[PDB]
C-alpha cells in the first residue's frame, strides 16, 4: 500500500527532529536506523509489512506480496545481508519449526514414525514430538550421536524447507521509536498548534525500558483476561510486583509526582499500579477477594498517580466485601469514606448513595443505622415521560404507511419521526458531543492557548493532554471566563462568526475530539447557534471543564432542535425495562434548572405485528 510507505517514513522523519530522541538512543542504534534509511525504497516495503505482522517463522512460499515483484527474492537476500531477516540459517529449535510445520505433513511425519496415536490435534502432537527430546540412552545404544532431535528437525526442514524471521534488536528499537511517537494517518491534517515541548517526561533510558517491558506485559495481561487464564498472569504480575518491589524505591516516579496529573497518566508506580489493578480483577474473578481487599488498601495509600483511581478502589472494597466476602464492619467504614472522597463524584458516587440506601435498608446492615446518619440527597423531579410507540426488531416504518418497509433502524428514528412531525425537524442526537463541538470552535485558540509546557509536545498532537484533567481550566481560569462570559453575552450572529471562522480556520486541521458530522451543514450550525445563546450552553461548559473525567456522556441522547423556530426538544431516550441512572438526571436536573427542554422519551415495547392488532 502507498499508505504504508508514506506512514512509517513520516513517523521516522518526524521523530528525527527531537534532540531528546537522539539523546535516548545510542550511536549503534543511530547507525541501525541510518542503515535502514540507505536501504532500497522498494526494499522498505518488505520490512514494513512484516513488522506490523505477527512474530513467527513464515515461509516465503506461503507469502504472496506481489506489489514489489513476483521475484523480489534478491531483496530478500539483500535485507538478510543487512542483518534483519534471519533466514532458515540458524534454526536449531524444534519448537519453532514445528510451529512453522503444518498439520497434514505433520501427520505424514507421524506416519513415518511409530508414535502413539498418530492422529490427534495440533498441540498435543507437538509436545508428543517434544517427549522425543527425552533420549540419549537408546540413541547412545550403539554410537552415541544424541542428536535424535537433530534428525527430527532435519526431516522437518526437508518437509518444510525455507523460512525467515526478524532479529530481536531491530524489532525492539522500532517498538521503542513507535511508542515514542505515540506517547499516549499521514493523511491527517493536524491543527494549528505549532509546538510547546519543554520538559522531558522520563528521567533515564533505563526507566523507559521498564515501560517497554511493562507495556508488553500489559498487552499480554489484556489478552490473558480474554482467555480465562489469569493464573499465569499473577506469577508474572508477582514478578511485576517484585519488579515494582525492586523499583518501589526509585526516583523516576518522584519526578512523575512532580509532573502534572496529565503527565502523571503513566508512571512506573502507576503502570505497576494498573498492573496491580488488573491483579485485583485477576484476584476477584478467581475468588481470592481477600487479597484484592488487601491490594486496594495499599492502593488507597497512594492517591497521586491518577487521582481518579482512589474512588475505584473504594468501590473495589465495597464490591469485594458485599457480593462474595460479606464483611460488614469494614464495608460500612468503606462506604462512609467512599461517599466522602473528593475523587468520588457524580455517577461514581451517586450510585454509592443508593448503594448506601440499598445497603442500609437490607436486614444485614439494618442494625448499623447509627453509622448511616450522614446521607446526602439528590432529590429529582423526573422529566415528563413522553412514552411513545413504534415498531421494533430496530425496525422503522418511516414514511407513508403504504410503504411499511423494514429498513432496520434504531430507537432514534422512532422518536425522531414523532418529534420531527411535532415541528422539531432538525436535531438528530449525540449526547454532549455537540456541546463540546460548540465549545470547540468558539473557544478553540483559548482551548489551545500555548506557551504552557508540553501543550503540543508531539509534532502531531491535537488535544493538549490536560484536556481530560481539570488543571486545563485552572490553567486558563481567567482566560476562559473572559471568553466564556463573552459568549454568554454574544448574540446569535456573533456565535455564527467563531463557528464558521474556526470551522474554516481549522477545516481539515485535526479537530481533536470535535466531530464535524455533528454540524452536518455549517449554516445549520450557524442556524443552530441562532437557536442557542448565552446561558443555554454556557451553564453546560462550567460543569464540563472541572468535572470532566466523570462527565463525558450521560447527556440527553436526542437533541432534536427546530432549525427555524428556535425552540429545541432535547431528549433522553428511555423506555420500559429501563430507567434513568442516578447521574443521568444530574444532567437533566441542572438542565431543567436552566430551563432546558429535555424530554424523557419512554418507548412502549411495540413490535411489527403489534400495530396490526388495532
Amino acid at each position: 500500500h502507498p499508505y504504508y510507505l508514506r506512514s512509517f517514513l513520516v513517523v521516522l522523519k518526524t521523530v528525527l527532529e527531537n534532540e531528546d530522541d537522539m539523546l535516548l538512543f545510542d550511536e549503534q542504534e543511530k547507525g541501525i536506523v541510518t542503515k535502514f534509511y540507505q536501504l532500497s525504497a522498494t526494499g522498505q516495503k518488505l520490512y514494513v509489512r512484516l513488522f506490523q505482522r505477527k512474530l513467527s517463522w513464515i515461509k516465503m512460499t506461503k507469502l504472496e506480496y506481489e506489489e514489489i515483484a513476483l521475484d523480489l527474492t534478491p531483496v530478500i537476500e539483500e535485507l538478510t545481508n543487512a542483518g534483519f531477516l534471519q533466514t532458515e540459517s540458524e534454526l536449531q529449535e524444534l519448537s519453532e519449526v514445528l510451529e512453522l510445520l503444518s498439520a497434514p505433513e505433520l501427520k505424514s511425519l507421524a506416519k513415518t514414525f511409530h508414535l502413539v496415536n498418530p492422529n490427534g490435534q495440533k498441540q498435543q502432537l507437538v509436545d508428543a514430538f517434544l517427549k522425543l527430546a527425552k533420549q540419549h540412552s537408546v540413541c547412545t545404544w550403539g554410537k552415541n550421536k544424541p542428536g535424535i532431535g537433530a534428525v527430527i528437525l532435519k526431516r522437518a526442514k526437508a518437509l518444510a524447507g525455507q523460512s525467515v524471521r526478524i532479529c530481536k534488536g531491530p524489532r525492539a528499537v522500532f517498538s521503542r521509536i513507535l511508542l515514542l511517537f505515540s506517547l499516549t494517518l499521514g493523511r491527517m491534517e493536524f491543527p494549528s498548534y505549532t509546538i510547546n515541548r519543554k520538559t522531558h517526561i522520563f528521567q533515564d533510558r533505563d526507566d523507559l525500558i521498564r515501560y517497554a517491558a511493562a507495556t508488553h506485559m500489559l498487552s499480554d495481561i489484556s489478552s490473558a483476561m480474554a482467555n480465562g487464564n489469569w493464573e499465569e498472569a499473577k506469577e508474572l504480575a508477582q514478578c511485576a510486583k517484585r519488579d515494582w518491589n525492586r523499583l518501589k524505591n526509585h526516583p523516576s516516579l518522584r519526578c512523575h509526582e512532580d509532573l502534572p496529573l496529565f503527565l502523571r497518566c503513566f508512571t512506573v508506580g502507576w503502570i505497576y499500579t494498573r498492573i496491580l489493578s488488573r491483579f485485583v480483577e485477576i484476584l476477584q474473578r478467581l475468588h481470592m477477594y481477600e487479597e484484592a481487599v488487601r491490594e486496594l488498601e495499599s492502593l488507597l495509600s497512594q492517591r497521586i498517580y491518577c487521582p481518579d483511581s482512589r474512588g475505584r478502589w473504594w468501590d473495589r472494597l465495597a464490591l469485594n466485601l458485599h457480593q462474595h466476602l460479606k464483611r460488614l464492619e469494614p464495608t460500612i467504614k468503606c462506604i462512609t469514606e467512599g461517599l466522602a472522597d473528593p475523587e468520588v463524584r457524580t455517577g461514581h458516587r451517586l450510585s454509592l448513595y443508593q448503594r448506601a440506601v440499598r445497603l442500609r435498608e437490607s436486614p444485614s446492615c439494618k442494625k448499623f443505622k447509627h453509622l448511616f446518619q450522614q446521607l446526602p440527597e439528590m432529590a429529582v423531579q423526573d422529566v415528563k415521560h413522553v412514552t411513545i410507540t413504534g415498531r421494533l426488531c430496530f425496525v422503522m416504518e418511516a414514511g407513508e404507511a403504504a410503504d411499511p418497509t423494514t429498513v432496520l433502524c434504531s430507537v432514534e428514528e422512532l422518536a425522531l419521526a414523532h418529534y420531527r412531525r411535532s415541528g422539531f425537524d432538525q436535531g438528530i442526537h449525540g449526547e454532549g458531543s455537540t456541546f463540546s463541538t460548540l465549545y470547540g470552535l468558539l473557544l478553540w485558540d483559548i482551548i489551545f492557548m500555548d506557551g504552557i509546557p508540553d501543550v503540543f509536545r508531539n509534532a502531531c498532537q491535537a488535544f493538549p493532554l490536560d484536556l481530560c484533567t481539570d488543571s486545563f481550566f485552572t490553567s486558563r481560569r481567567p482566560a476562559l471566563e473572559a471568553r466564556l462570559q463573552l459568549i454568554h453575552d454574544a448574540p446569535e450572529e456573533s456565535l455564527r462568526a467563531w463557528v464558521a471562522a474556526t470551522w474554516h480556520e481549522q477545516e481539515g486541521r485535526v479537530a481533536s475530539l470535535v466531530s464535524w458530522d455533528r454540524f452536518t451543514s455549517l449554516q445549520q450550525a450557524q442556524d443552530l447557534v441562532s437557536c442557542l445563546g448565552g446561558p443555554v450552553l454556557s451553564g453546560v461548559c462550567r460543569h464540563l471543564a472541572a468535572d470532566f473525567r466523570h462527565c463525558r456522556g450521560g447527556l440527553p441522547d436526542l437533541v432534536v432542535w427546530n432549525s427555524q423556530s428556535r425552540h429545541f426538544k432535547l431528549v433522553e431516550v428511555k423506555g420500559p425495562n429501563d430507567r434513568l441512572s442516578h447521574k443521568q438526571m444530574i444532567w437533566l436536573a441542572e438542565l431543567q434548572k436552566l430551563g432546558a427542554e429535555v424530554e424523557v422519551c419512554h418507548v412502549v415495547a411495540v413490535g411489527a405485528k403489534s400495530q396490526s392488532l388495532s
Partner: protein, 261 residues
C-alpha cells in the same frame, strides 16, 4: 555368484512377516558361512539380528562376500505370492542388480520365477555389546504373544519383575492396574510348556508396549521364546529356528525419568 536353495520356503516367508513393517530398508549381508541380517529401525530404538547358518541350506554356495540393500516391502510383496511349500531357488548375480527368486512347484507342474530392482543402502557397523543377563526366561511363544497383546489395552509400558517364584507382568493405565504372573513348569516335560526361569538377581525395568506386538509377529517361527534380563541392559527376545539358526530381538530399556517429565 551367490545361489542358495532352501527346501522350506515357508521359513523365508515367515521371517519377512516380522520384518515387513518393523524395518523398511536394510542391507542383505551374505557370507560363505551363512546368512546374517542386521539393521536398524527409523526410530533408532530396536535392533534385529539374524544368524542363518550355511548348514541349514539344502544347497549353498557363496563365492564372494556380498552386502546388498533391497527394500523390505518389495520382498514381502513377492513372498506372499508363493505357496507355503514351494522350493526357494535364491540366486544372486555378482554386481548385476538382479535377484533370481524361483518358486519351485512340489507338484513339478507350475514354474514361478521373479526378479526385482536392487537399491543401495548404507552400512553403519552396528555394535553388538555381548553381556550376561541375570534374569533368563524361556517360555512358549504362544503364551508370550497373549501376555504382550493382553496388556496392550490397559497401559503403554510394563514394569517387569523377575520374581524367582515366577515372572510377573504388570501394566497400569487410566482403567486401573493388572498384574499377570506364571509358575515355572516342573513336571510337564513338554518343551512347549516349560516356564523355566534362570535366577541370579531380581531386576525391574520398563519398556514400551507399542513394540511388543511387532516382535511377537515371529510366533509362527518357533514354539518357545527366550527372554534374558539384568540391571540396565536391553531386552532380548530370541527365537530358535530349528537347526537353521537363531534370531534375537534387541530393545533398550525405557528410561525411568521419561515418565517423570
Amino acid at each position: 555368484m551367490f545361489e542358495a536353495r532352501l527346501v522350506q520356503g515357508s521359513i523365508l516367508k515367515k521371517v519377512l512377516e516380522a520384518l515387513k513393517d518393523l524395518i523398511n530398508e536394510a542391507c542383505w549381508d551374505i557370507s560363505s558361512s551363512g546368512v546374517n541380517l542386521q539393521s536398524m529401525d527409523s526410530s533408532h530404538v530396536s535392533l534385529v539380528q539374524l544368524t542363518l547358518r550355511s548348514e541349514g541350506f539344502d544347497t549353498y554356495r557363496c563365492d564372494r562376500n556380498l552386502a546388498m540393500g533391497v527394500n523390505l516391502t518389495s520382498m514381502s510383496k513377492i513372498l506372499k505370492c508363493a505357496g507355503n511349500e514351494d522350493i526357494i531357488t535364491l540366486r544372486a548375480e555378482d554386481n548385476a542388480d538382479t535377484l533370481a527368486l524361483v518358486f519351485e512347484a512340489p507338484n513339478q507342474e507350475k514354474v514361478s520365477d521373479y526378479e526385482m530392482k536392487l537399491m543401495d543402502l548404507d552400512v553403519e557397523q552396528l555394535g553388538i555389546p555381548e553381556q550376561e543377563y541375570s534374569c533368563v526366561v524361556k517360555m512358549p511363544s504362544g503364551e508370550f504373544a497373549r501376555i504382550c497383546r493382553d496388556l496392550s489395552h490397559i497401559g503403554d509400558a510394563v514394569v517387569i519383575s523377575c520374581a524367582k517364584d515366577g515372572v510377573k507382568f504388570s501394566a497400569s493405565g487410566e482403567l486401573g492396574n493388572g498384574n499377570i504372573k506364571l509358575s515355572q513348569t516342573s513336571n510337564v516335560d513338554k518343551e512347549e510348556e516349560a516356564v523355566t526361569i534362570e535366577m541370579n538377581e531380581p531386576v525391574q525395568l520398563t519398556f514400551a508396549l507399542r513394540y511388543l506386538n511387532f516382535f511377537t509377529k515371529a510366533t509362527p517361527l518357533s514354539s518357545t521364546v527366550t527372554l534374558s534380563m539384568s540391571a540396565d541392559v536391553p531386552l532380548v527376545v530370541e527365537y530358535k529356528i530349528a537347526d537353521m539358526g537363531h534370531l534375537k530381538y534387541y530393545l533398550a530399556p525405557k528410561i525411568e525419568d521419561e515418565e517423570g517429565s
